[PDB]
Write a protein that binds this ligand. Sequence first.
Ligand SMILES: CCOc1ccc(C(C)=O)cc1-c1cc(NC(=O)c2ccco2)cc(-c2c(C)noc2C)c1
Length: 118
Amino acid sequence: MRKKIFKPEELRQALMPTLEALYRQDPESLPFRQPVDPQLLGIPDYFDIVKNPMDLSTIKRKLDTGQYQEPWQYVDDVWLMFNNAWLYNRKTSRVYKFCSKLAEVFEQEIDPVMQSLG
Ligand SMILES: CCOc1ccc(C(C)=O)cc1-c1cc(NC(=O)c2ccco2)cc(-c2c(C)noc2C)c1
């Protein structure tokens, strides 16, 4: 029942510790702390494959400015971030590996938090 509105302060307080847990993963979170810059990274085809880019800093901004109205929107952006990376990077690459590790941390952290919000 996702059209029920939550208060931005309450969403921030419950969901931000799960975002901080991702940021704490070093070096696994390093590829995800800023938007993908295809020029910087030498991958000019990135925006051809990844139509809706997402990363930790954008999620964090949306959380800090109250842009999520309900918590699955946050969960959606997190998985969008991980899906983009699993889609774009080769299964044998370091980034793919970091993505799988970071997604594992997120699954652990998010479940009791979402349980306590529903
Ligand atoms: C071509 C491989 O790069 C990527 C390809 C795809 C994606 C995604 C998320 O789909 C990410 C990266 C990526 C990005 C960054 N950091 C920055 O882009 C950045 C840092 C500061 C400013 O920009 C570091 C690394 C990285 C690390 C760590 N150790 O080895 C490598 C390599 C990898």
